[PDB]
Amino acid sequence: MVKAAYSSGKPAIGVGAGNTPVVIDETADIKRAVASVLMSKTFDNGVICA
Amino acid sequence: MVKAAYSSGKPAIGVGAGNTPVVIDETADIKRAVASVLMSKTFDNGVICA
């Protein structure tokens, strides 16, 4: 519906969300990264914006 | 063409002009008002924006 709001000839701003990626390289801590991802993703079954 | 620029599904801002009115009441100077209007209107035959 944000494309429906855009193509209506009126002023419109849309609050959306994109697919947010996470990059883990080789020189990072491994335990805290997995702990952080598992902590943030299960929050309210992952219906938070972005 | 500003309506053509608006209805294209892209970000767009338009530099336009409206009909600009002048209100002259009874408690004004009369000579300087007419002098100002005739001075500003004949500038470049009145093709200035607004």
DSSP for B15-48?
-----------TTS-SHHHHHHHHHHHTGGGG-S
Method of structure determination: cryo-EM
Four-residue CA torsion sign, B26, B30, B33, B39: positive
* Resolution of the model in angstroms: 3.5
Distance between CA atoms of B6 and A24, rounded to whole angstroms?
43
Q: Residue A49 catalytic?
A: yes
Q: In which residue are the tokens 């002009």 written?
A: B17
Put simply, the answer to whether B7 touches A9 (Cβ < 8 Å) is yes
Residues 19-38 of B with CB under 8 A from A: none
**Could you say which DSSP state residue B9 is in?**
S
**Could you say which DSSP state residue B43 is in?**
G
